[PDB]
Amino acid sequence: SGPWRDCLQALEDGHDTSSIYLVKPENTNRLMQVWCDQRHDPGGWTVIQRRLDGSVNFFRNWETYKQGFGNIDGEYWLGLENIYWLTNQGNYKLLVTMEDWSGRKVFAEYASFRLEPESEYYKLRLGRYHGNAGDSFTWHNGKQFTTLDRDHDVYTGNCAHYQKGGWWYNACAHSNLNGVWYRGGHYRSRYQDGVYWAEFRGGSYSLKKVVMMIRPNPN
Ligand SMILES: [Ca+2]
């Protein structure tokens, strides 16, 4: 309590309880609330996205993805502008944790994760992968962000109209973590628009719980 540059700075001053914290990145006056996961190894994780229970609508427009939406103690998207300022104050790694409907938990980690500015459509910059979920994000490396009202992908249509999220769509997605949460995992739709990570359970399986979290990775 009392704004922190990120969840790691809060942890370093003794707040090791996972909860809601106030964050203000360096070199900005941008204040935000975040959920800090201070338990997952090694602590200091700032949650930028979380799916858990289908309570929040992720089929949203650009301004909503820019500013952030959802419930900070539940499902939410932190906001492209907030994520930009966070990821540009140092080198941050990205950890994606995922759980299927049978209790299996896997992860994908990227040693660097940065977004370009809104002037560059929040283009994704991703570093090297390790994990046991398989790498379904690197296909999206270098792609701009796309929403239902702003097409910036390399598909001749708008991928958000089909995959139903806001995402760094290519043509269209190997991961669709801002897609439609389907109870029970297995689903069938005209288009694969679920919360999927293709290398783990494929495009027709919606993951029960997903977290995208970031933390300084200084080297
Ligand atoms: Ca397009």
Curated annotation (Swiss-Prot):
Name of this chain's protein:
Angiopoietin-related protein 2
Looking at the record's lineage, which domain of life comes first?
Eukaryota
Q: Which organism is it from?
A: Homo sapiens (Human)
Write out the annotated subcellular location.
Answer: Secreted
The taxonomy runs:
Eukaryota, Metazoa, Chordata, Craniata, Vertebrata
- Ranges for domain Fibrinogen C-terminal: 1-218
The set of disulfide-linked cysteines is 7-36, 159-172
In terms of the whole protein, what range is present? 272 to 490 of 493
Entry comment describing in which tissues the protein is expressed: Widely expressed in heart, small intestine, spleen and stomach. Also found in lower levels in colon, ovary, adrenal gland, skeletal muscle and in prostate.
PTM comment text: N-glycosylated.
**Primary role:** Induces sprouting in endothelial cells through an autocrine and paracrine action.
